[PDB]
Amino acid sequence: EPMANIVEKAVQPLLEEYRIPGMAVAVLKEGKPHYFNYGVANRESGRRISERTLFEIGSVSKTFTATLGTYAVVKGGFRLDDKVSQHAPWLQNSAFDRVTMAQLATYSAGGLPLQFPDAVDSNERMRQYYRQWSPLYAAGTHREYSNPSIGLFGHLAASTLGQPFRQLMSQTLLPKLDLQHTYLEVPDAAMVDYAYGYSKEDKPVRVNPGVLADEAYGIKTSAADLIKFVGANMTGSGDKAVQQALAMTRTGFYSVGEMTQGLGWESYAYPVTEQALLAGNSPAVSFKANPVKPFVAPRVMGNERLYNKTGSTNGFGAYVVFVPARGVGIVMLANRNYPIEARVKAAYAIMRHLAP
Numbered sequence: 001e002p003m004a005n006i007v008e009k010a011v012q013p014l015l016e017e018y019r020i021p022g023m024a025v026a027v028l029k030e031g032k033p034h035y036f037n038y039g040v041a042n043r044e045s046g047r048r049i050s051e052r053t054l055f056e057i058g059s060v061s062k063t064f065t066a067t068l069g070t071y072a073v074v075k076g077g078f079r080l081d082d083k084v085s086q087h088a089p090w091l092q093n094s095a096f097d098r099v100t101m102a103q104l105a106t107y108s109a110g111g112l113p114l115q116f117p118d119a120v121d122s123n124e125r126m127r128q129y130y131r132q133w134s135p136l137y138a139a140g141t142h143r144e145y146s147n148p149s150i151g152l153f154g155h156l157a158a159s160t161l162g163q164p165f166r167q168l169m170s171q172t173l174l175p176k177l178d179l180q181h182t183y184l185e186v187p188d189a190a191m192v193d194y195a196y197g198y199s200k201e202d203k204p205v206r207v208n209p210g211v212l213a214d215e216a217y218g219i220k221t222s223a224a225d226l227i228k229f230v231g232a233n234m235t236g237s238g239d240k241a242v243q244q245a246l247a248m249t250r251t252g253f254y255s256v257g258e259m260t261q262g263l264g265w266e267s268y269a270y271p272v273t274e275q276a277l278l279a280g281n282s283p284a285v286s287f288k289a290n291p292v293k294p295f296v297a298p299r300v301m302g303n304e305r306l307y308n309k310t311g312s313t314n315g316f317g318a319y320v321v322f323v324p325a326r327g328v329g330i331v332m333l334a335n336r337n338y339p340i341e342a343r344v345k346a347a348y349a350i351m352r353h354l355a356p
């Protein structure tokens with residue numbers, strides 16, 4: 001039962017039902033990446049999808065943001081249990097005197113919403129938004145997945161090292177991870193590689209700037225670079241501080257059902273049922289506030305576990321999953337924003353074949 005036939009069997013129903021123009025799949029197994037490419041980057045250009053095509057990975061970006069944050073912890077910028085206002089004096093006498101940096105990163109500050117209100121379109125309006133925000137829940141008790149929440153975490157983390165987020169990401173973290181095809185903004189020389197997204201109206205679309213977009217959803221990368229980042233999260237980085245940063249993202253803070261929330265990555269005990277993996281990625285978890293089952297203290301989660309993250313933009317749909325103990329990772333990048341349940345079912349089938 002060859003890998004190639006397992007991947008085809010899992011992916012073809014996606015390509016068919018969702019009319020996906022282009023998909024790049026990368027599988028890491030036995031210490032080597034394997035690439036499976038389908039379709040086109042741009043319906044109005046000749047270049048086919050390859051493992052070098054750049055896709056918008058949307059909220060998978062939060063795994064990079066989390067790693068920048070833990071890098072700042074390693075470098076002494078802050079501690080995860082610090083109050084947010086320690087690092088943002090403009091938030092003195094706000095909710096953020098009680099919220100911790102870890103709670104921002106884990107969407108548990110107390111009901112920060114999925115998106116900023118549309119009116120928040122500048123740095124000053126962003127600052128005012130956080131100053132004015134009235135919590136819905138006590139700090140730490142509820143998970144409400146939130147771009148403003150992890151966005152502020154990344155912004156403040158970089159500030160503790162005296163740098164803008166984009167600078168620290170592009171000049172320190174990505175180079176130390178040796179990621180040469182990963183961008184917050186795609187440079188001119190790489191534009192030939194940048195796919196277009198295809199919206200639910202079948203129109204070609206690209207992500208536009210937004211408040212804390214870099215932190216929450218802004219990375220463009222290839223399947224080759226993203227599977228390299230997955231590998232770093234399994235067998236490590238040769239940069240000592242980056243390795244400490246990567247390891248620290250495995251810190252779990254609470255659970256919701258069978259899912260444990262870490263920094264960026266969400267994880268499950270492995271073996272994991274398909275039902276549990278679907279539930280943890282479902283709208284009931286992703287787009288509703290859920291009361292958490294708290295941990296007494298944050299806990300490093302282990303190798304015998306499945307780590308994952310979904311992400312989407314207008315016209316793009318990404319999913320990444322890996323099991324460190326098994327040495328298997330899967331990256332699926334598409335230029336259609338197709339259903340998360342379908343991403344999960346396909347990846348689950350591939351994973352069950354490669355880690356029975």
Ligand SMILES: *C(=O)N1C[C@H](NOS(=O)(=O)O)CC[C@H]1C(N)=O
Pocket residue numbers: 057058059060145147216217286309310311312313340
């Ligand atoms: C992430 O890609 N963004 C935030 C949120 N992510 O939740 S998901 O991974 O379950 O899709 C919704 C989609 C997206 C966004 N529109 O900001």
